Write a protein that binds this ligand. Structure first.
Ligand SMILES: [Mg+2]
Ligand SMILES: [Mg+2]
Ligand SMILES: [Mg+2]
Ligand SMILES: [Mg+2]
Ligand SMILES: [Mg+2]
Ligand SMILES: [Mg+2]
Ligand SMILES: [Mg+2]
Ligand SMILES: [Mg+2]
Ligand SMILES: [Mg+2]
Ligand SMILES: [Mg+2]
Ligand SMILES: [Mg+2]
Ligand SMILES: [Mg+2]
Ligand SMILES: [Mg+2]
Ligand SMILES: [Mg+2]
Ligand SMILES: [Mg+2]
Ligand SMILES: [Mg+2]
Ligand SMILES: [Mg+2]
Ligand SMILES: [Mg+2]
Ligand SMILES: [Mg+2]
Ligand SMILES: [Mg+2]
Ligand SMILES: [Mg+2]
Ligand SMILES: [Mg+2]
Ligand SMILES: [Mg+2]
Ligand SMILES: [Mg+2]
Ligand SMILES: [Mg+2]
Ligand SMILES: [Mg+2]
Ligand SMILES: [Mg+2]
Ligand SMILES: [Mg+2]
Ligand SMILES: [Mg+2]
Ligand SMILES: [Mg+2]
Ligand SMILES: [Mg+2]
Ligand SMILES: [Mg+2]
Ligand SMILES: [Mg+2]
Ligand SMILES: [Mg+2]
Ligand SMILES: [Mg+2]
Ligand SMILES: [Mg+2]
Ligand SMILES: [Mg+2]
Ligand SMILES: [Mg+2]
Ligand SMILES: [Mg+2]
Ligand SMILES: [Mg+2]
Ligand SMILES: [Mg+2]
Ligand SMILES: [Mg+2]
Ligand SMILES: [Mg+2]
Ligand SMILES: [Mg+2]
Ligand SMILES: [Mg+2]
Ligand SMILES: [Mg+2]
Ligand SMILES: [Mg+2]
Ligand SMILES: [Mg+2]
Ligand SMILES: [Mg+2]
Ligand SMILES: [Mg+2]
Ligand SMILES: [Mg+2]
Ligand SMILES: [Mg+2]
Ligand SMILES: [Mg+2]
Ligand SMILES: [Mg+2]
Ligand SMILES: [Mg+2]
Ligand SMILES: [Mg+2]
Ligand SMILES: [Mg+2]
Ligand SMILES: [Mg+2]
Ligand SMILES: [Mg+2]
Ligand SMILES: [Mg+2]
Ligand SMILES: [Mg+2]
Ligand SMILES: [Mg+2]
Ligand SMILES: [Mg+2]
Ligand SMILES: [Mg+2]
Ligand SMILES: [Mg+2]
Ligand SMILES: [Mg+2]
Ligand SMILES: [Mg+2]
Ligand SMILES: [Mg+2]
Ligand SMILES: [Mg+2]
Ligand SMILES: [Mg+2]
Ligand SMILES: [Mg+2]
Ligand SMILES: [Mg+2]
Ligand SMILES: [Mg+2]
Ligand SMILES: [Mg+2]
Ligand SMILES: [Mg+2]
Ligand SMILES: [Mg+2]
Ligand SMILES: [Mg+2]
Ligand SMILES: [Mg+2]
Ligand SMILES: [Mg+2]
Ligand SMILES: [Mg+2]
Ligand SMILES: [Mg+2]
Ligand SMILES: [Mg+2]
Ligand SMILES: [Mg+2]
Ligand SMILES: [Mg+2]
Ligand SMILES: [Mg+2]
Ligand SMILES: [Mg+2]
Ligand SMILES: [Mg+2]
Ligand SMILES: [Mg+2]
Ligand SMILES: [Mg+2]
Ligand SMILES: [Mg+2]
Ligand SMILES: [Mg+2]
Ligand SMILES: [Mg+2]
Ligand SMILES: [Mg+2]
Ligand SMILES: [Mg+2]
Ligand SMILES: [Mg+2]
Ligand SMILES: [Mg+2]
Ligand SMILES: [Mg+2]
Ligand SMILES: [Mg+2]
Ligand SMILES: [Mg+2]
Ligand SMILES: [Mg+2]
Ligand SMILES: [Mg+2]
Ligand SMILES: [Mg+2]
Ligand SMILES: [Mg+2]
Ligand SMILES: [Mg+2]
Ligand SMILES: [Mg+2]
Ligand SMILES: [Mg+2]
Ligand SMILES: [Mg+2]
Ligand SMILES: [Mg+2]
Ligand SMILES: [Mg+2]
Ligand SMILES: [Mg+2]
Ligand SMILES: [Mg+2]
Ligand SMILES: [Mg+2]
Ligand SMILES: [Mg+2]
Ligand SMILES: [Mg+2]
Ligand SMILES: [Mg+2]
Ligand SMILES: [Mg+2]
Ligand SMILES: [Mg+2]
Ligand SMILES: [Mg+2]
Ligand SMILES: [Mg+2]
Ligand SMILES: [Mg+2]
Ligand SMILES: [Mg+2]
Ligand SMILES: [Mg+2]
Ligand SMILES: [Mg+2]
Ligand SMILES: [Mg+2]
Ligand SMILES: [Mg+2]
Ligand SMILES: [Mg+2]
Ligand SMILES: [Mg+2]
Ligand SMILES: [Mg+2]
Ligand SMILES: [Mg+2]
Ligand SMILES: [Mg+2]
Ligand SMILES: [Mg+2]
Ligand SMILES: [Mg+2]
Ligand SMILES: [Mg+2]
Ligand SMILES: [Mg+2]
Ligand SMILES: [Mg+2]
Ligand SMILES: [Mg+2]
Length: 144
RNA sequence: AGCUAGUUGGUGGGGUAAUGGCCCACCAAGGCGACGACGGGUAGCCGGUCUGAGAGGAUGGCCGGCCACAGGGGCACUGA
RNA sequence: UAGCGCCGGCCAACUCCGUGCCAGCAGCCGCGGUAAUACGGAGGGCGCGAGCGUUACCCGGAUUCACUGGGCGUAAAGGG
RNA sequence: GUGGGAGAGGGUGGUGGAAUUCCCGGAGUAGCGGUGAAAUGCGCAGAUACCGGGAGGAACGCCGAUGGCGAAGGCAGCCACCUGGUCCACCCGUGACGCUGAGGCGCGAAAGCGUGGGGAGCAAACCGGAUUAGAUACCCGGGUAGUCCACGCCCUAAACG
RNA sequence: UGAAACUCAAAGGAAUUGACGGGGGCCCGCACAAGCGGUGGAGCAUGUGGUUUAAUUCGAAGCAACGCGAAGAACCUUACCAGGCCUUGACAUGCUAGGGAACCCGGGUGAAAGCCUGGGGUGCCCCGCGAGGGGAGCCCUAGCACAGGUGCUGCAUGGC
RNA sequence: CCGGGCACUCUAACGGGACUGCCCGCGAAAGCGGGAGGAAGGAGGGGACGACGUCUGGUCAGCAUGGCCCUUACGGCCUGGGCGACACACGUGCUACAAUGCCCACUACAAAGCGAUGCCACCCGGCAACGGGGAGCUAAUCGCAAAAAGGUGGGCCCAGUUCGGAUUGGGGUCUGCAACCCGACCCCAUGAAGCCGGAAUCGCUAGUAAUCGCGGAUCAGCCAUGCCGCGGUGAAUACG
RNA sequence: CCGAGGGUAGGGCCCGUGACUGGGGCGAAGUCGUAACAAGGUAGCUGUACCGGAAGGUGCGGCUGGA
RNA sequence: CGCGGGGUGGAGCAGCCUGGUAGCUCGUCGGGCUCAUAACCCGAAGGUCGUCGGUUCAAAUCCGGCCCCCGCAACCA
RNA sequence: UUCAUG
RNA sequence: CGAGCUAGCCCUGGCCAGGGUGAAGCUGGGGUGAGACCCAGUGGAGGCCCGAACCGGUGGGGGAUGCAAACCCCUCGGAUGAGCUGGGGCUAGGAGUGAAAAGCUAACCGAGCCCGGAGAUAGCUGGUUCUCCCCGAAAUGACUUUAGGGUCAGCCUCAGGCGCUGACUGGGGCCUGUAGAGCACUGAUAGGGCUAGGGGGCGCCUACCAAACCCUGUCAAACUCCGAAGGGUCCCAGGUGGAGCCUGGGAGUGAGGGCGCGAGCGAUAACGUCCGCGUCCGAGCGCGGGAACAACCGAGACCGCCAGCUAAGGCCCC
RNA sequence: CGCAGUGAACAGGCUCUGGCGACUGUUUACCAAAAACACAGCUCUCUGCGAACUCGUAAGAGGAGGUAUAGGGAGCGACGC
RNA sequence: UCCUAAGGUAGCGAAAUUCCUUGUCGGGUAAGUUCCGACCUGCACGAAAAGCGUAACGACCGGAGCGCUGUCUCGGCGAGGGACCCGGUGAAAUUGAACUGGCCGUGAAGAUGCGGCCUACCCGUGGCAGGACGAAAAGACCCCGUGGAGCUUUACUGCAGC
RNA sequence: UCGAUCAACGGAUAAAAGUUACCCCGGGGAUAACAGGCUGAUCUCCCCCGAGCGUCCACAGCGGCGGGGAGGUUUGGCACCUCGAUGUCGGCUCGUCGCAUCCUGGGGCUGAAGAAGGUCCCAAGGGUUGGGCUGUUCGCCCAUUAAAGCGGCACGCGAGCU
RNA sequence: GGGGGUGAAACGGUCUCGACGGGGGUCGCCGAGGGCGUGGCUGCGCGCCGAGGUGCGGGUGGCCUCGUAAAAACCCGCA
């Protein structure tokens, strides 16, 4: 029921080489909050641990109908890919120096949520500032 | 930014070791106030101490002087 | 018995490793994004040493309340 | 003080023409208006332009300026009245009467407000026309308060040299 | 008349060098204008985006990437994917060392590579009519340092 | 083709020639407007040439290279596939959409080139691509080679056509161990879209644009219509 | 009589708090316009009034820190 | 609870005439412009016409009736 | 003389 | 005809005890250049304040055939004003007057009262006065500005004429399409088999997820291949009865109701409502039973009788 | 001197707020006195005087022996905005 | 984006207006459907049928405190005038006759009167009011009347006036 | 032969709309609102079947889908008495009754260790509070209580009152 | 206290919009996770009972030798 979400800083931070419509296996209740918009990806990507992907460190609120049936909210959820795609990205992590970041969590005609993963390079826009006068002149005094 | 009505002054007392509205009677309208009265906040004050180039700024612990307090407040007695 | 601070500049004393805008540092400027003399450790150094640092407070720097010792066109400031 | 001087200094009272609008009459005919270009609008109900007469309001072209006066605001047709400031000369008189001034008091553009009056132009608001993505704006048509007078308040300003 | 809380490490004045201007002046270039022929319409070729894919290798991204690196992709190229495989290896040597030392011929398994496999067997250092032994190139085995990377980073770089 | 021979065109060295050099007008001078002679004019026309630096431009995938990472794999070998896929979009080009055009024949006219495991003359065979002999060339000597557009005179008759040549089927030749993904051509069928193009946009100031072919590179073949060069015909306009 | 203290009633000053609200600072590369600085594409700023989501616009006047 | 009024493109709406002839703005997709997004320009495309049953040759059109939405009433006691 | 933003 | 109440106005008289606040002025002072202004005093202003008379009537209580067809008590509002009030006067009926309520206008005003038209009209309610005897309804249809009324027909009576025709029955002959029942049609249908179009991957393909057929099942007011009881009509008969048919006079009635049966509406509710066939009450509750009780059961009251037999119902007593 | 001194009688309960109406008034005689009506004030409109308007068939009268700062009507109802 | 002539401005705002509604928060109270202050998805405020304020004022209306109290928990006592007794004068509305019990039924559907039972000597006086569908007013609400008025109007038709 | 949405269609006028809470008259229980009645759809109660819960186990407690009643207190339906009047909501006052019980007294089961409680059977003899808000019955609360009963009696009660 | 409504969207008809692991099943040859294997093929099969060996030997039970009976230490302390 939720619209397309946004990984705001990752869309505006990492260069998206290509995408995948991945999948998430929700571990039992973390559904309606993601169906109402409670998701914040800041400090999260999708990390493998030697066989499979987990969407790491994603904070979703435990739903308030479960008065005591809450879940640890920022966890590593079992992401879903294909198997050749999965071992492909498992290779590509060590081939190219990537980081695998989500872009959105959008729903399909089966009424399911799919986390749109995407590749990174870094998109290094960070300006290493040119040297001010009071360091260039003491480097020049060293050069004297 | 006005304040004060024992407030300001006199006379006559009373009390005090003693002057004094220190307190009481009667009369007189006075006393104070932008040189900061009144109200509020803060504060023991000073020799000093610290700092400062000096002027000054801060501070008043210990030591020394003085006031005030002795659970808060009032009150006299005794006695120099 | 020798420790504590500090080593980007101010401020005396610099390399390596680990970290990768994270963990963290910080008094200001700012460092941190994969070669970090600014973070964490080691080496080395510097300062002080039974102390070294931090904090708060005060004075100095602050000529930044200017009496010594500032200004007022445009900088804050001329009153219509 | 004596003699003058210049001045949009201020206030009162008149007064003059141009121009705008409106009215009235004469003529007039298919448009005028408007912009960068248009439409809105005004117009065959005789509009625009043109002539003549009248009303009435406001500002005063040229002179006129890099001018003058005023303490500041400001102040501009001309006349008269009342009146301030200021300057020159004479060196005539007073004999330091001086200067600045917190608080005061007065003046204080323009806007604004009150009570009347006046209302021609201009014109916030407002309505329309385009404009533009949108336009609450520029541009254009209209259009009230206001602008104006008198009294009375407001008392700010890039009240700046 | 006129605060503080809180916040900022600046706010700001003049001036300089630039950049910019829907600012000016002057001057220019196929920049416009004047022309002629095109593209965009169509079919194809090639390159690219995207999608697909097991992979559709990667890089280039306004001008200044897009008939470009690619002045030759059936395999080679090929870096990619799939599968068969090999491990100090296609290679550069250099060491310890039983071995074979230069090398030729095939057979079998196999998609090929690879792996398994049998017949001829070295002048020379040499003391040699001697048994031969130290032992010099090269080559295979077991190892060693290492080779290798079209893996990343052209904001760490040279070069261009 | 030579016998005689080099006159020339040429070839490729070395030289000259063009500099405001002359003269006039303007002008302080530089220089400008013009003229003459010259083959040429006021940088004669083109190249190569691209400053200090910017875009933290591009390339670690041409190489070199610091750093980090893989080291029975991210290395290495091979077979096969892909790099060519396709719902579409884009960029650059090519052919087109015709009668100034197209088809067949015939005859001209270039420079630049490039070739001993190559270019292949000239025959024979095959309509043809090509195949079998084989001449010459170590190449101003032989070859690619035909030049095309032009011209000649025959066709077509404004027609989606004798325009167009995409597509698809069939017959084949070469290269290569190998043409199915995916080669090039040849031939015979096929004959589509397309009848000058939206909003926009590009190229060009003289041998330029336009049109036409040729060569080369890499290369077994080739994707080539691309690129790099060469010449043939050869404009309009630039008021400003 | 005065008298500390207590009460009552009403003042003053200061402080905490108060649904809600007006603004203010400050966040993350939010939305919305483009007001300013270039004749900021309507010269700007200010007084004041009115209006307008909003910067702002317009009127009257000033100023030049505009031509 | 009863009247009457709508249902039409992603949304907002014209409509559709006895039934046969369906569109408009914005949005959309592709292009063009732009350094890039806006804006603007060019090509189209999109709809079981509220479901359902009815007479009809044929329904979106006309007749019912049912579901959502709108506007009304729900008065006298 | 038009025309908003990174 | 009334403004003798009241509402307003005109003229002319009256009335308002007493206190209190302290306005403008005026006087003096402060101030200033002059003032504005600010103090004190003085003054006496007011739809000013408290408050009696007076006017009014706010809240409550009493009163309620009262003391009174508006009162009394307590409490209140105004009380020098838009005041109150005496006298003299004006205005009058769709008109006056109104500080507005449609209030007031002679004790009841959305149009006074009195007389007259006028014995208005009343589809309405009431009421209708002696006796006996005979016969005796209806509450239905059509139409109504009609629904409580009326016209006509139906039912009723009277008189006359006609003379077995009448209700009822028997015999015949028909008509019809209800109850039943059945799928022959129009539809709805349940299970199984067969098999056209969509759904599972869809190339032929896969469960009654699905037409027609097919056996077996059913249902219908708007279905009938059938279809009775009956009912209607005609004829031939029985039928002498407050039977009929016709003409004329007089009507009443057109609010019906219960019960039974057939149905509708409702809920397979109502002493519900609307019909059809009756019946009964209406008008027979007059009587018996039902405990009582119009319509249930029995039965049609001319009168009498201290006779009898009986119906429904009873038989222990009441 | 009383418990008590307007010693009896007459003789205000007050405050905080909020609505509505500015206020004082006036009304529904005889169930409503109010948040109604009026009210000064505000604007609109009409009327140049044989005035509009009103009453009356007409004269005539009110208007008014008034004259736009005046009358008639309508609305709102002090004041502030 | 459609419609309009135009889409409600300021100021108010669950209101004398808010249906849902006791909106939802606050405040007061122990507890507050009312009150006050707020927020405003205002069925349906809103600018001279004026809007929002407003000091004074009000026999207005709403809500709180304080004081005081028989208003009340919850009543009590006492006086006076009636009431009650006696003497005097002595009305009234109403009235079918009444020799007028209660309950279960029943009946025009709410009985003293009918049936069954159960109580019950005849007659008063003072009382309370439950019944006699008590009285009063030929319902004042509703309906019918082809009634009647008042009033309105872009009902119809006239007339005044113009 | 033509002029009728004279369609209110056997056609009142050739021509006609509203309102009355300012009302008035004649009438009606022919015709409503209150109440009663008949009914019992709805409402309240208990009653069957028992899927299914209740870890297990239909039944301690529950009880789908459905069914059968009772009671007349709700909202109604019907219009039968009353419109020549049956005064009408609530409160006060006084009560009285029913049981389908809220306590209290008994008791059964219990998923009843004890204390509690739940549910069901008997059981009206006695109770069943004081407040805040609202006109309120009813509710929401406040503080209690052993419990703060559900009703009827013309939604008891106005010839008793407000 | 009841009526309405959702707390993943065709008034049914499918699938984890496809994939990830966790459960189970299918397919094959890969010959082997395990193994009955299985016949063309192709033997004389060598363990007891035993003692010993390298530079001064605790180790090392057959890591080797060998039959009327006897041979070498592949490593460890290693002055
Ligand atoms: Mg940064
Ligand atoms: Mg940086
Ligand atoms: Mg710096
Ligand atoms: Mg002493
Ligand atoms: Mg003293
Ligand atoms: Mg100092
Ligand atoms: Mg003390
Ligand atoms: Mg003490
Ligand atoms: Mg002493
Ligand atoms: Mg140093
Ligand atoms: Mg970290
Ligand atoms: Mg540190
Ligand atoms: Mg690193
Ligand atoms: Mg480092
Ligand atoms: Mg300091
Ligand atoms: Mg200092
Ligand atoms: Mg000084
Ligand atoms: Mg400044
Ligand atoms: Mg200044
Ligand atoms: Mg003047
Ligand atoms: Mg001057
Ligand atoms: Mg002198
Ligand atoms: Mg002004
Ligand atoms: Mg004003
Ligand atoms: Mg003014
Ligand atoms: Mg517009
Ligand atoms: Mg004004
Ligand atoms: Mg001023
Ligand atoms: Mg100002
Ligand atoms: Mg100035
Ligand atoms: Mg100035
Ligand atoms: Mg431009
Ligand atoms: Mg094209
Ligand atoms: Mg084309
Ligand atoms: Mg690419
Ligand atoms: Mg390029
Ligand atoms: Mg290939
Ligand atoms: Mg290949
Ligand atoms: Mg080896
Ligand atoms: Mg880096
Ligand atoms: Mg570079
Ligand atoms: Mg040249
Ligand atoms: Mg590298
Ligand atoms: Mg790379
Ligand atoms: Mg290299
Ligand atoms: Mg490899
Ligand atoms: Mg390629
Ligand atoms: Mg092309
Ligand atoms: Mg041709
Ligand atoms: Mg060549
Ligand atoms: Mg040959
Ligand atoms: Mg050659
Ligand atoms: Mg040649
Ligand atoms: Mg073209
Ligand atoms: Mg164009
Ligand atoms: Mg070539
Ligand atoms: Mg190529
Ligand atoms: Mg953020
Ligand atoms: Mg601006
Ligand atoms: Mg701007
Ligand atoms: Mg601008
Ligand atoms: Mg402008
Ligand atoms: Mg400027
Ligand atoms: Mg505004
Ligand atoms: Mg602005
Ligand atoms: Mg404006
Ligand atoms: Mg459409
Ligand atoms: Mg729609
Ligand atoms: Mg009503
Ligand atoms: Mg333009
Ligand atoms: Mg623009
Ligand atoms: Mg923006
Ligand atoms: Mg008379
Ligand atoms: Mg009067
Ligand atoms: Mg005086
Ligand atoms: Mg007085
Ligand atoms: Mg008075
Ligand atoms: Mg009275
Ligand atoms: Mg009084
Ligand atoms: Mg009074
Ligand atoms: Mg009084
Ligand atoms: Mg009289
Ligand atoms: Mg009247
Ligand atoms: Mg009347
Ligand atoms: Mg009358
Ligand atoms: Mg009569
Ligand atoms: Mg008559
Ligand atoms: Mg009738
Ligand atoms: Mg039947
Ligand atoms: Mg059938
Ligand atoms: Mg049929
Ligand atoms: Mg029949
Ligand atoms: Mg009738
Ligand atoms: Mg009878
Ligand atoms: Mg009987
Ligand atoms: Mg017998
Ligand atoms: Mg007294
Ligand atoms: Mg009043
Ligand atoms: Mg009255
Ligand atoms: Mg009053
Ligand atoms: Mg009254
Ligand atoms: Mg007069
Ligand atoms: Mg009013
Ligand atoms: Mg509200
Ligand atoms: Mg409320
Ligand atoms: Mg509360
Ligand atoms: Mg209350
Ligand atoms: Mg409203
Ligand atoms: Mg108005
Ligand atoms: Mg108000
Ligand atoms: Mg009052
Ligand atoms: Mg109260
Ligand atoms: Mg009492
Ligand atoms: Mg008796
Ligand atoms: Mg009875
Ligand atoms: Mg009897
Ligand atoms: Mg009684
Ligand atoms: Mg009665
Ligand atoms: Mg009656
Ligand atoms: Mg009638
Ligand atoms: Mg009348
Ligand atoms: Mg007429
Ligand atoms: Mg007629
Ligand atoms: Mg009719
Ligand atoms: Mg009346
Ligand atoms: Mg009235
Ligand atoms: Mg009754
Ligand atoms: Mg029942
Ligand atoms: Mg049942
Ligand atoms: Mg009952
Ligand atoms: Mg009835
Ligand atoms: Mg009645
Ligand atoms: Mg137990
Ligand atoms: Mg009881
Ligand atoms: Mg009752
Ligand atoms: Mg009563």
């Amino acid at each position: 029921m939720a619209p397309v979400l946004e990984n705001r800083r990752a869309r505006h931070d990492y260069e998206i080489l290509e995408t995948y419509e991945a999948g998430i296996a929700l571990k039992g209740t973390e559904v309606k909050s993601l169906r109402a918009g409670k998701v914040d990806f800041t400090g999260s990507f999708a990390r493998f641990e030697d066989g499979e992907l987990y969407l790491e460190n994603l904070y979703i609120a435990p739903y308030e109908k479960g008065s005591y049936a809450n879940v640890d909210p920022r966890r590593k959820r079992k992401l879903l890919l294909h198997k050749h795609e999965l071992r492909r990205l498992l290779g590509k992590v060590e081939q190219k120096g990537l980081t695998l970041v989500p872009l959105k969590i959008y729903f399909n005609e089966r009424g399911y949520a799919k986390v749109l993963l995407g590749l990174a390079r870094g998109k290094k826009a960070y300006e290493k500032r040119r040297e001010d006068k009071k360091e260039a002149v003491r480097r020049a005094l060293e050069e004297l």
